[PDB]
Ligand binder design. Structure first.
Ligand code: CLA
Ligand code: CLA
Ligand code: CLA
Ligand code: CLA
Ligand code: CLA
Ligand code: CLA
Ligand code: CLA
Ligand code: CLA
Ligand code: LMU
Ligand code: PQN
Ligand code: PQN
Ligand code: SF4
Ligand code: SF4
Lengths: 730, 162, 138, 81, 69, 220
């Protein structure tokens, strides 16, 4: 390509058919290249055979995410502001049931807008702003309206840094191809200087402006816009102005104190969102580390070190090419970023970190399943992109004889095991349930697997739960309750509208879901593991790195020779994970409502959204639609003519879109060709078709329009199924 | 003496697999398995039959006498035989009609010894039908039988258990 | 094996190639030339070196041992050579035979390309009912 | 047939056209006049598996081959092991 | 050279594939023909699959006074 | 309510037949595969390239057909019953303003009128029906387990069996022990069948158990 250059046009390329592999989009017309162009639009086997740029693009086309997450948030802060309900909800929590969005009464619309709290028509929320927002050491609607434009500021600017890259004549190699410092910085002072900084604006301002909110008032009968400077006088109620101490150290006297923190654990009676008196200390006690920690270092050295006998000789030298990969140092990350998201999903529901959550049921489970699909949707990826490594990234083979060349050495092996693992599971991990049916429908309970028939006896208790809620008696200092109230030992009194967390008991019907997870988590990974491992060569095809990591299927021979590849192992690996997460969700809420969520009154006689129906009745896998799907969902199929209605009214579409995927999943290809011409014929008679040769779907595009649909179908189905059984009773 | 044997993938050539690590060929294990049909065919298959029949025999009891269909039996014909003197039988000819994937029809008698064997190309087959009979014949009297000093043994039992 | 140790194509371990069905039936093996000590790619997932001898690696099945070409001719050399080993001898002299480099002319050998009638209007379906007396066994 | 998938064309020239396909196709057997004069559709095909890598490149202008062989050894599918 | 210990007993070494146990307990031909009929195996199995399996199922299912399903 | 199902049984045998008429109207061949013959029917698959070519045997359109014969012969039967049901031990207004839409076809029918059966294994002992509901979940499994066959495609299966048949051969107490048939993964037509001949029973064994398990108490 010209047009023409090198050097010697500014005149930009708008006009002249094509670009992207060289007997390119050819003069001669076609359609396939219009899904080409969008797909693989980002890729790197083309653009140039030379690293250089690519990192100079990804550090820019990156940017436009932050900026975006930044245009987003703004319409959420704005939204969570003038489309109010926040002002109204906060003087009045336990009571309200929040909104931010509202229609405009065009056509049918309005049904969707149904009285939500501080006196107005709207559609609800299961996205816990209104609750980060508890923070506001200040309060005010127009104020969020500054935090809002403060958002659009970071954006335009944190979006003109993206002009101020690639398009501007760019940095180069050394800049990233000296890695030497990167984490040094990152973790030290941002990971640090945020958490740190967050400390300073987490007791300064917030703690006090909810220390005396957890009582009454109406805001501006509290927390001015400046009030919190030098005036270290209201900081007087929430500890000393250090009195006689000077910059910690010890020649200090406490005859009666010990700074803010004074460590909690449990839950505010009046706002059980976990205590804040702590929340500063923990973030402070973070940062320090990061503050000390981001001070390594300059790199091989540490990895060029510990080897052994069978261990990893190539451990030593574990990648020069880890300054020369991406597709590698992205895949690693996704496993972590991803696997480090759904660890949120627990510490959240068994330890709320915001005021008013749990009581708020629906506004932190939405969460625990949204955060849950990322700690999964980012993991199969975290494999895909390793397959993208394993196939291609490096120039030649300069990488040699090491940890990997090792793992591969065995490979019909690491995956030889893992397999049997799964059929051991599955048999012990699902037909287990099927016993029950076949023998409870035969009907002889003597011999089921009930929490009571097969020998276990009115106790689960003695394991580690019961040595967690009881541990404030070790090296442990203490502080009433535990760490997470859901643990075996002691305490009850949690909240005065509805409930929050309490013990959460186990045994079987907790024993075996917990095991289906195993088998589910395991056969997921089998297919990804073997998939990324056998990326490039095999004894079904060895001539098998020769195009890319996709390729439809090699060809009718060898018997099958179809699925193979690794786009496709990252195609049938999604297919499982949709279950992996989709059944983990199914788990939590049936627990968390069967027990936990429920409610106090006199003598606090607890009354769960369901008197533990779980008991003897999830163990039957029909009980999973006797007690679940057919029981709850009665709220989705009753939901017409209401306010939420948009869920029942989705629940048919998307419970349709899924049942459209199979068409894309289950079908041939020269088929819709053979068909597309009958069409093309009738077209030509009137004189109406040929130009831009209309073509069927690109074997693997077809699979691309399976899967993606099967998910946005099979998923939102419950996104509806859910929001419709926590809004309204529960 | 060395880093781990004279350091080797397999017996020798590294183009067969097996990747002889431990759990494969440590004198620690490879000896816990060669009075039996691992490396070398001792006597014929004749006798190995019942140490195989029997050992595998008095298994399958608590499995189907303590996990039995309606379990913990108060029937004098369980805590042992009961039925399971069926598994050995449903499989003591799950075998015989696999020894129809062996024919090769002879009668040498070489379970007595001669000149330090090898059985040489001992791999592959080189155990005809008139061998695989005297084994799966040792299996029946090893299966059925090995089920009764299970049963016959009273049951002085350890238990609980937590 | 060892008492006779005749090697050439360096490797160390691997759960890849050759297993039970290469004795009990057929064998298949590739041989080659090379300049100075160079590290290669490998079928079966692994990777090693060269120098010489015969440079004679043995391989499970012959689709496997020509892939030394589909990359092992993007790494210099005229000469690479795979035969067929049995458990006893010959017939099927695999890269032996006559000339070499599938795209030259000495003889014609087999192939043909036609059937009875050529690609032309076989809208004509299957003809006679299969009956032992009219030239349809080819 | 026993491997019978027609990739034939009319040029049977094989330069920047087609080579790919494990063993099966030792052609260049010049028929007395067909331009770059190398012709037909195969050599001795009782050797290898069932690709359609066979066309994918260099014309067959009609069909292109695939599996059709039925009578199918094992050396004819990777897996006789 | 003291830690040149001339390999404190070579061993010979490689014990062998040679001989680290005698063999199998003398208990044998204490079953000679004892339990034959699979040691008269000369055409059988069809016999033991009507016989054995008509008496793991004839009386095995029937019973004189239920103790029902 | 009947001016729709009656146009949706009509969208069945039409679509079902555009594919069978088509399936048929060139088992002979076409542009993508011109000379598609001497074997016509089940040659399922062809090499990649050309456009990318697949379930383009007149069998695999038959294969593809049987889904809409399993979707017409569902809308039609579905219809009678809801009607009948209602037209018996009760109303008919029911099908009237509640078949003119879609959600409701799921809610009252599908969701109303299963009741009887499923709380029939019930945490509280085996009541009236038990054959049926266990059939009905046997129904939902045989079905679902179609999909493998259907989104799996011999390639992936064969290959790990290549690794999984490095086991035995390389593991003691299970060596020498020879198969007489070489471990492989299902033919590239076979599994389009078996997922189906699987998709079908599940499906046809579900309504079998469904209607009966609900036209039996009823009410109607
Ligand atoms: C006003 C300015 C402007 C102009 C005229 C250009 C022009 C150009 N840029 Mg560019 N760029 C810009 C701003 C601009 N850029 C900014 C602000 C950034 C950083 C944010 C970049 C980062 C960038 C990179 C990495 C690259 C270019 C390249 C190019 C060249 C190819 C452009 C193209 O066709 O992409 C078409 C794409 C668009 C017009 C849209 C850009 C996508 C982002 C910024 C917004 C869209 C996201 C949006 C939310 C859509 C998703 C939601 C959807 C549902 C609506 C071309 C000369 C490329 C090059 O050098 O040649 C290979 C190179 O790849 N640019
Ligand atoms: C940190 C990571 C992140 C990044 C930066 C990338 C980057 C990349 N990935 Mg990738 N990937 C990721 C996470 C990431 N991935 C994860 C988590 C997965 C697992 C699902 C994958 C699975 C994956 C595959 C299989 C592939 C890539 C490929 C690529 C490359 C192609 C990108 C492209 O052209 O856009 C592609 C995006 C589109 C064409 C837009 C279509 C999006 C559709 C499906 C919409 C999604 C549904 C949604 C609900 C619809 C919107 C709403 C609607 C209803 C209105 C690029 C380098 C491709 C490659 O060939 O590598 C070179 C290859 O295809 N990725
Ligand atoms: C085209 C075909 C025909 C038709 C009309 C249907 C229709 C349906 N099938 Mg189906 N199916 C068919 C052939 C067909 N199938 C075949 C051949 C098979 C294989 C044998 C199946 C196998 C199958 C299964 C397994 C399932 C279905 C299901 C469904 C139903 C989903 C419920 C619904 O849509 O409520 C109708 C109400 C609405 C659609 C309201 C929509 C309002 C929303 C979406 C907003 C408005 C639209 C707007 C554009 C969306 C926003 C997007 C925006 C970003 C642009 C739907 C009635 C599913 C079911 O529910 O029970 C069986 C089930 O999953 N089918
Ligand atoms: C409901 C499902 C059906 C079943 C039973 C299975 C089962 C399996 N799939 Mg699978 N799969 C399915 C649908 C199914 N799939 C679908 C629809 C898709 C895609 C749409 C996939 C995509 C897929 C992939 C990519 C993989 C699998 C794998 C597996 C295997 C995992 C190991 C295991 O636990 O198996 C054994 C356990 C079971 C099958 C469940 C227990 C069965 C019960 C009913 C017991 C019956 C036994 C009893 C003796 C019956 C005899 C009685 C007599 C009358 C016959 C397993 C065989 C993986 C694999 O092979 O790894 C090992 C591989 O990762 N699947
Ligand atoms: C979160 C998402 C997001 C972001 C930040 C980007 C960012 C980018 N995309 Mg992109 N893209 C996305 C989603 C996104 N995309 C999706 C969903 C698709 C559908 C497949 C694409 C399809 C696509 C193509 C085909 C191209 C890009 C390109 C680009 C780059 C060009 C920027 C430019 O030229 O001027 C910025 C221009 C403006 C801001 C003008 C305003 C335009 C509207 C949309 C606002 C930029 C890195 C171009 C590229 O190759 O660079 C890497 C290329 O042309 N994208
Ligand atoms: C993350 C979010 C994103 C999304 C999904 C929305 C979605 C919406 N915004 Mg919005 N908005 C956003 C970012 C977003 N906004 C940002 C960054 C700003 C600041 C510029 C705004 C400022 C804004 C205003 C002023 C309005 C909306 C309104 C709306 C609603 C009207 C629909 C529409 O935009 O077209 C039609 C809709 C729910 C409208 C509304 O809420 O009335 C019902 C109102 O017009 N938005
Ligand atoms: C990095 C953090 C963040 C930031 C930007 C600030 C900033 C400030 N703090 Mg401060 N503070 C923080 C975290 C932070 N703090 C935390 C975590 C604690 C508790 C451990 C405190 C406890 C504290 C006290 C008791 C006081 C301040 C004061 C101040 C002000 C001047 C003295 C000073 O600290 O620095 C500048 C350094 C010098 C002037 C020397 C200044 C606005 C003081 C004030 O009100 O103004 C004078 C004083 O009252 N802070
Ligand atoms: C509680 C009941 C029931 C009874 C009465 C028995 C009794 C017995 N089992 Mg046993 N077993 C049972 C259920 C039962 N089992 C179940 C459900 C399983 C599941 C697989 C087993 C698996 C099993 C194995 C694998 C073995 C036995 C062994 C034994 C016997 C040896 C006792 C011993 O410890 O060696 C005493 C050893 C010395 C004094 C030295 C003993 C007769 C064997 C055995 O215990 O040998 C060690 C053999 O190990 N059992
Ligand atoms: C749900 C199935 C029962 C199995 C677990 C039962 C074991 C423990 C007993 C009840 C557990 C619930 O704990 C609950 O006890 C009492 C209910 O009588 C309530 O008792 C509360 O009410 C009164 C008001 O002053 C006083 O008697 C107590 O000081 C106070 O704690 C509490 O709200 C709660 O602590
Ligand atoms: C149904 C199906 C098709 C047929 C699907 C097709 C042809 C979808 C493509 C339709 C396009 C998106 C229509 C585009 C036309 C409009 C964009 C043009 C008008 C512009 C708007 C204003 C309407 C395949 O091609 C296929 C391929 C491989 C495996 C499975 C399948 C498969 O299942
Ligand atoms: C699992 C699976 C396999 C693997 C093959 C398997 C798992 C065969 C396993 C045998 C099962 C366990 C036999 C059980 C069936 C019984 C009902 C007995 C059948 C009796 C017949 C004679 C009727 C494929 O080969 C395949 C090929 C093409 C598309 C999809 C797939 C696919 O999904
Ligand atoms: S290149 Fe294709 S003749 Fe030409 S189509 Fe026939 S093999 Fe050669
Ligand atoms: S197309 Fe057929 S003959 Fe040609 S290489 Fe492939 S398998 Fe061999």
């Amino acid at each position: 390509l010209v047009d023409r250059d090198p050097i010697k046009t500014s005149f930009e390329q708008w006009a002249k058919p094509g670009h992207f592999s060289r007997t390119i989009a050819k003069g001669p017309d076609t359609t396939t290249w219009i899904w080409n162009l969008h797909a693989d639009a980002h890729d790197f086997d083309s653009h140039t055979s030379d690293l250089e740029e690519i990192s100079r693009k990804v550090f820019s086309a990156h940017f436009g995410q932050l900026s975006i997450i930044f245009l987003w948030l703004s319409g959420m802060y704005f939204h969570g502001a003038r489309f109010s309900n926040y002002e109204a909800w906060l003087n009045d929590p336990t009571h309200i049931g929040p909104s931010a969005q509202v229609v405009w009464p065009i056509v049918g619309q309005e049904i969707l807008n149904g009285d939500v709290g501080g006196g107005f028509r709207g559609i609800q929320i299961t996205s816990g702003f209104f609750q980060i927002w508890r923070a506001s050491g200040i309060t005010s609607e127009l104020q969020l309206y500054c935090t809002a434009i403060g958002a659009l500021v970071f954006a335009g600017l944190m979006l003109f840094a993206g002009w101020f890259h690639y398009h501007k004549a760019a940095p180069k190699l050394a800049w990233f191809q000296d890695v030497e410092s990167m984490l040094n910085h990152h973790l030290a002072g941002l990971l640090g200087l945020g958490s740190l900084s967050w400390a300073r604006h987490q007791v300064h301002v917030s703690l006090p402006i909810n220390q005396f909110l957890n009582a009454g008032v109406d805001p501006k009968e509290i927390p001015l816009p400046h009030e919190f400077i030098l005036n270290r006088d209201l900081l007087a109620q929430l500890y000393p102005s250090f009195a006689e101490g000077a910059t910690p150290f010890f020649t200090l006297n406490w005859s009666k104190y010990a700074d803010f923190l004074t460590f909690r654990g449990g839950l505010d009676p009046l706002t059980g969102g976990l205590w804040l008196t702590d929340i500063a200390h923990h973030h402070l006690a973070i940062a320090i580390l990061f503050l000390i920690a981001g001070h390594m270092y300059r790199i091989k050295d540490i990895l060029e070190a510990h080897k052994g006998p069978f261990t990893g000789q190539g451990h030593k030298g574990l990648y020069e090419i880890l300054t020369t990969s991406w597709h590698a140092q992205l895949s690693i990350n996704l496993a972590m970023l991803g696997s480090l998201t759904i660890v949120v999903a627990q510490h959240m529901y068994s330890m709320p970190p915001y005021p008013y959550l749990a009581t708020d049921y629906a506004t932190q489970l939405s969460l625990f399943t949204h955060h849950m699909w990322i700690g999964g949707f980012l993991i199969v990826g975290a494999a895909a992109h390793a397959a993208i490594f394993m196939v291609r990234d490096y120039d030649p083979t300069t990488r040699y004889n090491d940890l990997l060349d090792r793992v591969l050495r065995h490979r019909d092996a690491i995956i030889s095991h893992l397999n049997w693992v799964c059929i051991f599971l599955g048999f012990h991990s699902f037909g287990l349930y099927i016993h029950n049916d076949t023998m409870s429908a035969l009907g002889r309970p003597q011999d089921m697997f009930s929490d009571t028939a097969i020998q276990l006896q009115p106790v689960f208790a003695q394991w580690i739960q019961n040595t967690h809620a009881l541990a404030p008696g070790t090296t442990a200092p203490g502080a009433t309750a535990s760490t997470s109230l859901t643990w075996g030992g002691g305490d009850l009194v949690a909240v005065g509208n509805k409930v929050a967390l309490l013990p959460i008991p186990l045994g079987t019907a907790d024993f075996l879901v917990h095991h289906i997870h195993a088998f589910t988590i395991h056969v997921t990974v089998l297919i990804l593991l073997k998939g990324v491992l056998f990326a490039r060569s095999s004894r079904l095809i060895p001539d098998k790195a020769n195009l890319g990591f996709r390729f439809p299927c090699d060809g009718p021979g060898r018997g099958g020779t179809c699925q193979v590849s690794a786009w496709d192992h990252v195609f049938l690996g999604l297919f499982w994970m949709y279950n992996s997460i989709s059944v983990v969700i199914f788990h939590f809420s049936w627990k968390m409502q069967s027990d936990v969520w429920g409610t106090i009154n006199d003598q606090g006689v607890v009354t769960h959204i369901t008197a533990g129906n779980f008991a003897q009745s999830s163990i039957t896998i029909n009980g999973w639609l006797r007690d679940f799907l057919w029981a709850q969902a009665s709220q989705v199929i009753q939901s017409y003519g209401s306010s939420l209605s948009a869920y029942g009214l989705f629940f048919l579409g998307a419970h349709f879109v899924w049942a459209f995927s199979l068409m894309f999943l289950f079908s041939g290809r020269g088929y819709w060709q053979e068909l597309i011409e009958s069409i093309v014929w009738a077209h030509n008679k009137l004189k109406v078709a040929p130009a831009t040769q209309p073509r069927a779907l690109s074997i693997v595009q077809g699979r691309a329009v399976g899967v993606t649909h099967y998910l946005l179908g099979g998923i939102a189905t419950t996104w509806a199924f859910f929001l419709a059984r926590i809004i309204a009773v529960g | 003496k060395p880093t781990y044997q004279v350091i080797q993938p397999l017996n020798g050539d590294p183009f067969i697999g097996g990747l002889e690590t431990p759990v494969t060929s440590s004198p620690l294990i490879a000896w816990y398995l060669s009075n039996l049909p691992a490396y070398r065919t001792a006597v014929n298959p004749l006798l190995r039959g019942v140490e195989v029949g029997l050992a595998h025999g008095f298994l399958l009891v608590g499995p189907f006498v303590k996990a039995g269909p309606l379990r913990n039996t108060e029937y004098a014909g369980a805590a042992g035989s009961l039925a399971a003197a069926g598994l050995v039988v449903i499989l003591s000819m799950c075998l015989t009609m696999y020894g129809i994937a062996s024919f090769k029809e002879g009668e040498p008698s070489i379970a007595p010894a001669l000149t330090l064997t090898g059985r040489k190309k001992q791999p592959d087959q080189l155990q005809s039908a008139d061998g695989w009979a005297k084994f799966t014949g040792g299996f029946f009297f090893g299966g059925v039988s090995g089920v009764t000093w299970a049963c016959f043994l009273m049951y002085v039992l350890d238990l609980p258990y937590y | 094996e060892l008492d006779p140790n005749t090697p050439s194509p360096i490797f160390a371990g691997s759960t890849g190639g050759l297993l039970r069905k290469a004795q009990v039936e057929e064998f298949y093996v590739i041989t080659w030339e090379s300049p100075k000590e160079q590290i290669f790619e490998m079928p079966t997932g692994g990777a090693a070196i060269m120098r010489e001898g015969p440079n004679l690696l043995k391989l499970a099945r012959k689709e496997q041992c020509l892939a030394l070409g589909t990359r092992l001719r993007s790494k210099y050399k005229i000469k690479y050579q795979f035969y067929r080993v049995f458990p006893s001898g010959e017939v099927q002299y695999l890269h032996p035979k006559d000339g070499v480099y599938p795209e030259k002319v000495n003889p014609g050998r087999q192939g043909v390309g036609l059937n009875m009638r050529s690609i032309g209007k076989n809208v004509s379906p299957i003809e006679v009912k299969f009956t032992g007396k009219q030239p349809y066994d080819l | 047939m026993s491997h019978s998938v027609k990739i034939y064309d009319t040029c049977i020239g094989c330069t920047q056209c087609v080579r790919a396909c494990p063993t099966d196709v030792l052609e260049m057997i010049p028929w007395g006049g067909c331009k770059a004069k190398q012709i037909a559709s195969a050599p001795r095909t009782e050797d290898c598996v069932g690709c359609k890598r066979c066309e994918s490149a260099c014309p067959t202008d009609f069909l292109s081959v695939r599996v059709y062989l039925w009578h199918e050894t094992t050396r004819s599918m990777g897996l006789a092991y | 050279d003291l830690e040149d210990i001339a390999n404190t007993t070579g061993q010979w070494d490689v014990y062998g594939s040679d001989a680290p146990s005698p063999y199998n307990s003398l208990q044998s031909k204490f079953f000679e023909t004892f339990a034959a009929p699979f040691t008269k195996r000369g055409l059988l199995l069809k016999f033991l699959i009507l016989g054995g399996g008509s008496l793991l199922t004839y009386v095995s299912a029937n019973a004189p006074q239920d103790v029902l399903p | 309510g009947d001016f729709l199902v009656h146009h949706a049984i009509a969208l069945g045998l039409h679509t079902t037949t555009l594919i069978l008429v088509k399936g048929a109207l060139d088992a002979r061949g076409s542009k993508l595969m011109p000379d598609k013959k001497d074997f016509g029917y089940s040659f399922p698959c062809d090499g990649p390239g050309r456009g990318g070519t697949c379930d383009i045997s007149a069998w695999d359109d038959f294969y593809l057909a049987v889904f809409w014969m399993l979707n017409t012969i569902g809308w039609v039967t579905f219809y009678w019953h809801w009607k009948h049901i209602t037209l018996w031990r009760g109303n008919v207004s029911q099908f009237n303003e509640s078949s003119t839409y879609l959600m409701g076809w799921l809610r009252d029918y599908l969701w109303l009128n299963s009741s009887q059966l499923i709380n029939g294994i019930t945490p509280l002992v085996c009541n009236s029906l038990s054959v049926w509901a266990w059939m009905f979940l046997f129904g939902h499994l045989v079905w679902a387990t179609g999909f493998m066959f259907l989104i799996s495609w011999r390639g992936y299966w064969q290959e790990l069996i290549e690794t999984l048949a490095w086991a035995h051969e390389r593991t003691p107490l299970a060596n020498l022990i020879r198969w007489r048939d070489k471990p492989v993964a299902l033919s590239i037509v076979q599994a389009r069948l078996v997922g189906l001949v699987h998709f079908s029973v599940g499906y046809i064994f579900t309504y079998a158990a469904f209607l009966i398990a609900s036209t039996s108490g009823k009410f109607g």
